[PDB]
Ligand binder design. Structure first.
Ligand SMILES: *[C@@H]1O[C@H](CO)[C@@H](O)[C@H](O)[C@H]1NC(C)=O
Lengths: 48, 48
């Protein structure tokens, strides 16, 4: 559902979906090739 | 007729092996993609 999300101060708008991307334990978010945020980590559920 | 048939049969090789041209269309595609990539990558600059 297209929502306004605020992940630990990171503000944005979009739909958040389940991701097959595997973040290494130290990685907190992912950026696309042109430096646009593509994936994020849930502070609570540790979900990608 | 035989000479024409031989030449038209060699066309299918010489079009993609000898190169020369057929790089113009790929160059057009590459220039368009480069322009779009640079435009969307300029969104990461703070500009001060
Ligand atoms: C916050 O608490 C929940 C349970 O309420 C837990 O599952 C989650 O891992 C916690 N968040 C952390 C450790 O970042």
């Amino acid at each position: 559902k297209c929502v306004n999300f605020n992940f630990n101060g990171l503000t944005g708008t979009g739909v958040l979906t389940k991701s097959n991307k595997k973040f290494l334990p130290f990685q907190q978010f992912g950026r696309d090739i042109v430096d646009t945020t593509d994936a994020v980590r849930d502070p609570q559920t540790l979900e990608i | 007729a035989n000479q024409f048939n031989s030449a038209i049969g060699k066309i299918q090789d010489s079009l993609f092996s000898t190169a020369s041209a057929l790089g113009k269309l790929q160059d057009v595609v590459n220039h368009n993609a480069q322009a779009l990539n640079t435009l969307v990558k300029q969104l990461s600059s703070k500009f001060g």
